[PDB]
């Protein structure tokens, strides 16, 4: 009911400023430009991460286990890993 709702009018905007119809064009363009730029910056951290986690280790340093490698080793081993461990344990620790 208040006069603040008059701002929703675009039929007669040419009677006050007629500026809204041109500024939102820039805002849509500015959003598109930042979409292309920011998506490039954030997404392109993967080639560095994919390379470092696979080539940055050296034999004169200790490679320490990360969180994901702790969970995968303990809670995501396959059947062959389970067999090979017990196969080594039964033959050498039990049966000698």
Partner 1 sequence: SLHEKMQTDYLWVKDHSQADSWAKARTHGYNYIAHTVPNKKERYEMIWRSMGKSTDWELEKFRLGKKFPDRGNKRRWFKNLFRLIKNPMGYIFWKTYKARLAKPSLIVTSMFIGFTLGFIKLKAQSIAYSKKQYATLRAGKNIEGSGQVHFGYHDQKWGMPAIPMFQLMYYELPGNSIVVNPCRNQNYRLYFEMRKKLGI
Partner 2 sequence: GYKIRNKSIFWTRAGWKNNWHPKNFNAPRPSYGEFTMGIRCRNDHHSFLRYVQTYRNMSRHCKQYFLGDKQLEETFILGLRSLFLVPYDSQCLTDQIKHGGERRFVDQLDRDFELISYNTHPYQLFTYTVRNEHLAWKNEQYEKIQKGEKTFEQELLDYLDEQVLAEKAKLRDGQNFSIERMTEIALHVFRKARAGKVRPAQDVRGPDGNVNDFLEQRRPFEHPNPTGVTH
Ligand X SMILES: CCCCCCCCCCCCCCCCCC(=O)OC[C@H](COP(=O)([O-])OCC(O)COP(=O)([O-])OC[C@@H](COC(=O)CCCCCCCCCCCCCCCCC)OC(=O)CCCCCCCCCCCCCCCCC)OC(=O)CCCCCCCCCCCCCCCCC
CA dihedral 30, 34, 35, 36 (to 10 degrees): 110
Q: How many CA atoms lie within 13 A of 64 on its CB side?
A: 2
Q: Is 21 in the site for partner 1 (CB under 8 A)?
A: yes
Helix count (H) and strand count (E) of the chain? 4, 0
Binding-site string for partner 2 from residue 27 to residue 66, where x marks contact by CB under 8 A and - marks none? ----------------------------------xx-xxx
For position 9 contacting partner 1 by CB under 8 A, the verdict is no
Output the smallest distance, CB 20 to partner 1, in A: 13
In this structure, are residues 63 and 57 in contact, taking their beta carbons and an 8 Å threshold? yes
Binding interface with partner 2 (CB under 8 A): 61-62, 64-68, 70-72, 74-76, 79-80, 82-84, 86-88, 90-92
């Amino acid at each position: 009911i208040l006069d603040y709702l008059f701002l929703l009018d675009l039929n007669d905007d040419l009677t006050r400023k007629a500026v809204f119809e041109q500024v939102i064009i820039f805002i849509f363009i500015y959003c598109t430009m930042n979409f292309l730029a920011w998506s490039t910056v954030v997404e392109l951290i993967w080639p560095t991460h994919f390379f470092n986690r696979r080539h940055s280790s050296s034999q004169e340093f200790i490679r320490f286990r990360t969180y994901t490698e702790v969970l995968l080793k303990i809670s995501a081993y396959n059947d062959f890993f389970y067999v090979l461990n017990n196969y080594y344990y039964n033959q050498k620790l039990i049966l000698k």
